[PDB]
Amino acid sequence: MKKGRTLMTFVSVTGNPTREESDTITKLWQTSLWNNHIQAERYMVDDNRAIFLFKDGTQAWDAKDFLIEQERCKGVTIENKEYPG
Ligand code: NA
Numbered sequence: 325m326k327k328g329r330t331l332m333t334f335v336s337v338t339g340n341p342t343r344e345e346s347d348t349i350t351k352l353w354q355t356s357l358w359n360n361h362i363q364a365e366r367y368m369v370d371d372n373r374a375i376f377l378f379k380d381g382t383q384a385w386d387a388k389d390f391l392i393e394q395e396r397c398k399g400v401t402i403e404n405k406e407y408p409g
Pocket of ligand 1 (some may be wrong): 338
């Protein structure tokens with residue numbers, strides 16, 4: 325199967341970060357997830373907000389559990405459902 329395999333999510337960063345600061349931070353998270361068998365593409369969309377696109381969308385909730393445990397993670401959104409950090 326090809327279609328409906330991936331899932332997009334939004335990850336927000338706390339404070340008033342510059343785009344480059346959020347970039348450094350969210351990159352750390354992306355790599356940690358990658359190193360733990362959760363592969364995702366990461367795109368900056370705001371100064372404090374990135375899209376995490378999970379290659380295996382099923383993993384999005386496990387990734388979310390990891391993400392919200394991070395100090396600079398403001399929250400994660402999965403399909404219009406917000407999980408506060
Ligand atoms: Na906070």
